[PDB]
């Protein structure tokens, strides 16, 4: 897609992506803040602290 | 209009910007994931389900 900027204006594409990414970074950091697991500002413990076994992802764990 | 060499320069600048941000953000997400993996296992990662009932949970 080398010639994309020949057709689509790169300058405003980059300006708009910068504005949208400022908004997106704010939104995503706010999503993390809202999360108890991920709010570094409140510093809640991870559930991994209190569980002996690894929780995993895609691990097909059972009760 | 945009000349061939001007589009070339824009292309290198765009590649540098996007790839630098992409790699820095990949390292950032890898670090945040190693710190606390984003996606819970089947058991979840809610504190209330694993903490010993005196650890307060905001959830």
């Amino acid at each position: 897609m080398w010639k994309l900027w020949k057709f689509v204006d790169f300058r405003m594409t980059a300006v708009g992506f910068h504005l949208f990414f400022a908004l997106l970074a704010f939104a995503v950091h706010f999503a993390c803040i809202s999360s108890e697991r991920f709010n570094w500002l409140e510093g809640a413990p991870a559930a991994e602290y209190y569980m002996d076994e690894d929780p995993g992802i895609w691990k097909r764990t059972s009760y | 209009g945009l000349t061939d060499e001007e589009c070339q320069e824009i292309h290198e600048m765009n590649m540098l910007g996007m790839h630098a941000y992409w790699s820095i953000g990949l390292i950032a997400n890898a670090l945040a994931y190693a710190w606390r993996p984003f996606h819970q296992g089947r058991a979840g990662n809610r504190l209330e389900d694993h903490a010993p009932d005196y650890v307060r949970s905001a959830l």
Binding site: I57, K59 | W22, I27, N29, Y33, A34
Partner: peptide, 26 residues
């Protein structure tokens, strides 16, 4: 477990996509 797998995948992607290497495959 698989958290290390995701971290390794993200690190590999970051290393591959870094400009000093992203430009090598231009």
């Amino acid at each position: 477990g698989d958290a290390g797998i995701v971290v390794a995948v993200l690190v590999i992607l970051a290393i591959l996509g870094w400009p000093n290497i992203s430009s090598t495959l231009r």
